[PDB]
Each structure stands twice: as structure tokens, then as C-alpha cells.
């Protein structure tokens, strides 16, 4: 009839589905703030597995460890722009790499929720935690247009051109809500940080160059929304939507590292 929820109980959930998104790897002129270089790294439809464990030691407190990982290499894309001419608003260089692999992607998130409002149908509270997210790509082959289109050509097919990975880590705060009627349950989380630490590594294999960038104190917004049905008092089948935005050798004013991503998964949660 309704969910069976005991004190000091805990849940385990697993879901499966898809990751998409877009990262930007940026280079600015530290003197003028003018954008010099931008590579757009896409994640097209990577298969992922998500796990979630919750424990309610008290009626007002939940402890939560969750995370996801790509299951294998996935489909991506990369576009690389330079603005080599200050006297021009349009980029002078564009290289395209449709054959870009997403080598891996993962995330984990350790947190607590403190429930401030609670009744028969509604729960609302504050959350805080620590989260890290990682992405890795390799762009291969592709084509290049340089000097406003006067140099054009192709990279050797299948050959690695640029390797790139990002890591975002942050403590965060947020608001958590729940709505239940009968056997339907809706959860919504909103997360925020002004304390994001970003790192990336870029290997330009054909230039014998490696770039490292690091930023600090950038902004993050995220949401987790899941809607489910208890097929039994202890077992919930659910769909989950997720959205994350990490705002923006190489340091300080020169560096820019960002990402947007979303996940759509479905699975099962069980309460012990």
C-alpha cells in the first residue's frame, strides 16, 4: 500500500542509462582577456551504470554515497578553434574530429541530508557533501582549416591527435525535497558550489606538447530528479534525470575549464 520505511534502515539502488554533455578547454590572453583557443569536447551517448547507497541513522539525517561510471569507451566529438588574429572576431582556425572517443567518465558524491520539514507527503531539507567528476577523451584523425580557410587538410585516419582529461572536485551545499502519495515518489535535489577545483591535462601528440591547467573557486550548479513507483513496499522502480554545470603550464587568467552534462537512467531501489 505505502512504502515500508523503518528507522536505521538503508537503501541500495542501481540504474543504467546514458551520459551526454560538452566540455570546453580554454586558452585566454592573460593581458587582454581575449579568447585565443577553445576546444569543445562532446560526449554523445555513453552507456553508464549508477549506484546509490543511503542510510538513515536518524529520522532527520541521511548519509549517502553515490556514483556512476561509463561501462566502456563511448562516442564523442571534438572541435578545436583558434583566434590567431586580434583584429578579427571570427576564429582563424578550426579543426574537426568526429572520430573522438570518450575513454571514460565517472563521478562519486558523498553527502549528508538534514531533513528540516517532514510530514506524510513532503520532505524538505538541506544537503552538503563532496563530489568529484572525471572525463577522458581521445580525438583521432579529422580535418583542419587554418588561416581563414587557406590551409586545409586531413589528419591520418585512426591516429591519435589530442588526448584530454578533466577532473572537477568540490564541496557543495544544496536543497533536497521529496513528495510521496500512495506508491509514487518524486525526489528533487538542487546543488551549488563556489569552491570547484578543476584540473585538466591535454596531450597534443603530433606537437610533442603536454598542457596542464588548474583553476580554483569556480561555480557549479546541479540537479537530481527521480520519479518512481514502489512495486512493493520495499522496492522502487524509477527513472532519474541529472544535470550538472561546471562554469569556467597554464594558470590564472589564461585558463578556462568547464563542463555541462546530464544523465538519464532507470533502475531499482531496495530498502533494507
Buried b (16+ CB within 10 A) or exposed e, 47-81: ebbbebebebeeeeebbbebbbbbeeebbbbbbbb
The grid coordinates of residue 147 equal 588561416
* Distance of alpha carbon 95 from alpha carbon 38, whole angstroms: 11
202 is catalytic: yes
- The one catalytic residue in 24, 29, 79, 82 is 82
Does residue 84 contact residue 136 with C-beta atoms inside 8 Å? Answer: no
52 is catalytic: no
* Neighbour count for residue 240 (Cβ, 10 Å): 21
- Dihedral over Cα of 11, 12, 16, 17: its sign: positive
- The one catalytic residue in 94, 183, 204, 247 is 204
**Residue corresponding to grid cell 537530481:** 224
* Distance of alpha carbon 25 from alpha carbon 202, whole angstroms: 9
* Dihedral-angle region of residue 253 (phi above 0 means left; psi in -120 to 50 means alpha; beta otherwise): alpha
Q: Which residues contact 111 (CB under 8 A, 6 or more apart)?
A: 63, 64, 127, 128, 129, 130, 131
Active site amino acids: 80, 82, 202, 204
Amino acid at each position: 500500500l505505502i512504502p515500508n520505511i523503518s528507522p536505521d534502515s538503508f537503501t541500495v539502488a542501481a540504474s543504467t542509462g546514458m551520459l551526454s554533455g560538452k566540455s570546453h578547454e580554454m586558452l585566454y590572453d592573460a593581458e587582454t582577456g581575449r579568447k585565443i583557443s577553445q576546444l569543445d569536447w562532446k560526449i554523445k551517448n555513453v552507456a553508464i551504470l549508477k549506484g546509490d547507497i543511503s542510510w538513515d541513522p536518524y529520522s532527520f539525517l541521511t548519509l549517502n554515497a553515490r556514483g556512476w561510471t561509463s561501462l566502456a569507451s563511448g562516442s564523442g566529438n571534438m572541435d578545436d578553434y583558434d583566434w590567431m588574429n586580434e583584429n578579427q572576431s571570427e576564429w582563424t582556425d578550426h579543426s574537426s574530429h568526429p572520430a573522438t572517443n570518450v575513454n571514460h567518465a565517472n563521478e562519486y558524491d558523498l553527502n549528508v541530508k538534514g531533513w528540516l520539514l517532514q510530514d506524510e507527503n513532503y520532505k524538505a531539507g538541506i544537503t552538503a557533501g563532496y563530489q568529484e567528476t572525471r572525463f577522458s577523451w581521445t580525438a583521432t584523425g579529422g580535418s583542419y582549416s587554418y588561416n581563414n580557410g587557406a590551409y586545409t587538410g586531413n589528419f591520418p585516419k585512426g591516429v591519435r591527435v589530442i588526448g584530454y582529461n578533466q577532473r572537477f572536485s568540490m564541496p557543495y551545499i544544496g536543497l533536497a525535497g521529496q513528495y510521496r502519495i500512495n506508491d509514487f515518489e518524486l525526489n528533487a535535489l538542487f546543488k551549488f558550489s563556489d569552491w570547484v577545483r578543476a584540473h585538466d591535462n591535454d596531450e597534443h601528440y603530433m606537437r610533442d606538447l603536454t598542457f596542464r591547467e588548474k583553476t580554483s573557486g569556480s561555480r557549479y550548479y546541479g540537479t537530481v530528479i527521480n520519479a518512481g513507483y514502489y512495486v512493493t513496499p520495499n522496492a522502487k522502480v524509477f527513472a532519474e534525470f541529472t544535470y550538472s554545470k561546471y562554469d569556467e603550464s597554464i594558470g590564472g587568467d589564461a585558463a578556462g575549464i568547464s563542463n555541462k552534462n546530464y544523465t538519464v537512467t532507470a533502475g531499482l531501489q531496495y530498502r533494507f
